[PDB]
Amino acid sequence: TCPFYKKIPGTGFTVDAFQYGVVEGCTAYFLTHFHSDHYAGLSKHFTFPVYCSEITGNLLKNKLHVQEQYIHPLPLDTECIVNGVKVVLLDANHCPGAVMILFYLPNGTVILHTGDFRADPSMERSLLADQKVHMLYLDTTYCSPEYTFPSQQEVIRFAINTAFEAVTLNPHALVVCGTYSIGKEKVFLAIADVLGSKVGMSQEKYKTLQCLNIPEINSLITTDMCSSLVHLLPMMQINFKGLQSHLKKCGGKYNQILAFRPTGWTHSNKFTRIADVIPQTKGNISIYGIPYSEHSSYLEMKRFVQWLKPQKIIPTVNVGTWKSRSTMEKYFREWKLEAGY
Ligand code: NI
């Protein structure tokens, strides 16, 4: 049974609610982004209308084989009418194709559902600037002040400088980057660009990237592993054992691996600056954990909410424990008292 925080009151709509069977009263199922915890339940046998971005709709058709007649892609930043209700999709600054959804209820209530997002001051000049929001369904993934991490630009500067140094010192070093979902493509694309290489990967990953409308992508990626010195591997293979095994397969072309694991936050963030990050090393293999987040830091979240000034907040992440819920509610009240709404 579908939880209340996935239902939009006063509509026939649900958000990211595909694992509950037929939801009573639902006339349109919205999907914010193509990550498995959110699409869980969709397949080629789904026969209700799904509303989403163009990029999410490419992934649904080619990866999950959802039939075309049930995919309803909407343009961003554009007022659309769905089953009698005005909606707008906004870029969520999450993974490719990820959106926030603005619903303009027939009774005058305005609701923002962030989906998964990384709050940014650029959102303060979207279509959100133009009207009041009563209810905010908020991605609270890192809603506590211990969650700090650098900008995505600082992290990519670290990665490019580390990779270029290593490979210039040793032209026989291979770079490997871990992946297990869409998102974070700038890590491997920025490293391959500085090295003058295409990124090499499996046919299944190539297929996924071909759905993302990234400009000039045919120039940047390939399935010919032998032609590339930046390889993508599943995140589970980014360990000394899996990397040793991969280096064997490359036929003595390479004699060293430098590997990256883009994580979100890890507790080494509460002590160490990005500049001071060091790898774990075993022989000719080094592994860097880099804090490349596609979710809001605590401070980014707080700034967004204090600007938007919603009347009510409904968290969508960390809702399963009383301790988490009580923590989050305490911060929402602080933010409101400090800002004066
Ligand atoms: Ni996500």
From Swiss-Prot:
Q: What is the effect of changing residue 295 to A?
A: Impaired nuclear focus formation, reduced interaction with PIAS and increased sensitivity to cisplatin
The residue ranges crossing the membrane are none
Tissues expressing this chain: Expressed in brain, heart, kidney, liver, pancreas, placenta and skeletal muscle.
Cystine bridges? none
Give induction info. During mitosis. The mRNA encoding this protein contains an internal ribosome entry site (IRES) in its 5'-UTR. This 5'-UTR generally suppresses translation while specifically promoting expression during mitosis, when cap-dependent translation may be impaired.
Please give the annotated consequence of changing residue 139 to N.
Answer: Impaired nuclear focus formation, reduced interaction with PIAS and increased sensitivity to cisplatin
Signal sequence segment: none
Where, per UniProt, does this protein localize? Nucleus
Indicate the quaternary assembly.
Binds constitutively to TP53BP1. Binds CDC27, which is itself a component of the anaphase promoting complex (APC). Binds PIAS1.
Q: Which family does it belong to?
A: Belongs to the DNA repair metallo-beta-lactamase (DRMBL) family.
Function comment: May be required for DNA interstrand cross-link repair. Also required for checkpoint mediated cell cycle arrest in early prophase in response to mitotic spindle poisons. Possesses beta-lactamase activity, catalyzing the hydrolysis of penicillin G and nitrocefin. Exhibits no activity towards other beta-lactam antibiotic classes including cephalosporins (cefotaxime) and carbapenems (imipenem).
Protein name, please? DNA cross-link repair 1A protein
